[PDB]
Amino acid sequence: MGDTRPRFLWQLKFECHFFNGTERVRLLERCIYNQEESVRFDSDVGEYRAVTELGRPDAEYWNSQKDLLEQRRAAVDTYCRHNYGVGESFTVQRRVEPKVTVYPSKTQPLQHHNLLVCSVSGFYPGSIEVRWFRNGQEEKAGVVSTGLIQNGDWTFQTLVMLETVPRSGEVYTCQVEHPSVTSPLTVEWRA
Amino acid sequence: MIKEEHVIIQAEFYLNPDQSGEFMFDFDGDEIFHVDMAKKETVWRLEEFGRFASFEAQGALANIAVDKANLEIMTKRSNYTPITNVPPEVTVLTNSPVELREPNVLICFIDKFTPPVVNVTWLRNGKPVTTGVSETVFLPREDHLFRKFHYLPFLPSTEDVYDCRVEHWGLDEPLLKHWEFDA
């Protein structure tokens, strides 16, 4: 755009890191000028610390305020653990079952199918395992994945493909292991 | 055994001279909610979240006010050193595997850019799309850059072509990202 006027950005990030549930909690207050962190409060440190020289005054000023220091030290309880307790049910405990489909496909424009695709979409959390079976026997060779894709709408998707030229009569099975189902989902495709 | 690490981030920023402010919560890379400064209200990323928790947007406004002040202070402290434009990478993807006549969403993912000011346009068959599109606020990154999602509902067809046009001060030219359904 023709607005060539200089831009000045100020970011403030409060990170609550939770380890083994609420066993270990760490608060990180980060002040960022443009794309550079200048000062931070680390609960494992207990006081403000300058990241760049630009933030040294603030670190000195804020450390002189004992009310602020005590409140920030207690923030691991009054802020991080509080919000964890409030949001655990729909975040940490969020379980969405994946929609699983199986279809034949091709690696390139070509007159035979050289791929068996298993699409696993719309699930949460991201941890998932996918196995292929030919006639009830697991095929571990020629399996290629697109990796874990985060859609930004609290869902994940992935493709898991089996490089094979399916033959008439064979029955392929995609198996999806995910914390949302007590038994792994199975989808069959009959060639 | 031990449970996986989870991180909740309260991410807020203020930008001059645009006078833009943002306040949002993030859980493991997903937005929980943000605060719309206009209308002064908490917008949950998933509406269902509003039935389990609440947040007073007024405080976010207060925080943004403080951020504005701090930005100005820092602006003078750095001898009015401006931010360096970082151009984004743009990826077009689909919500799910594409099937003809089966409704879907085209996602334009704008990534790794700063400042958080971008201009995104959808182009169906070359023509700009102005309604029915949706977007997210500017999402935080660990390298303090930004992410953004733009969404376009559509009926897949072999005849139609799509483009995401992204303009940013770090780009030499508007960035076009193409997408088509071919068999």
Partner: peptide, 15 residues
């Protein structure tokens, strides 16, 4: 229940 925000502090000014 209510989600709490972390309160922002003002930086030191110039003189």
């Amino acid at each position: 229940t209510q989600l709490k925000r972390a309160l922002t502090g003002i930086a030191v000014e110039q003189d």
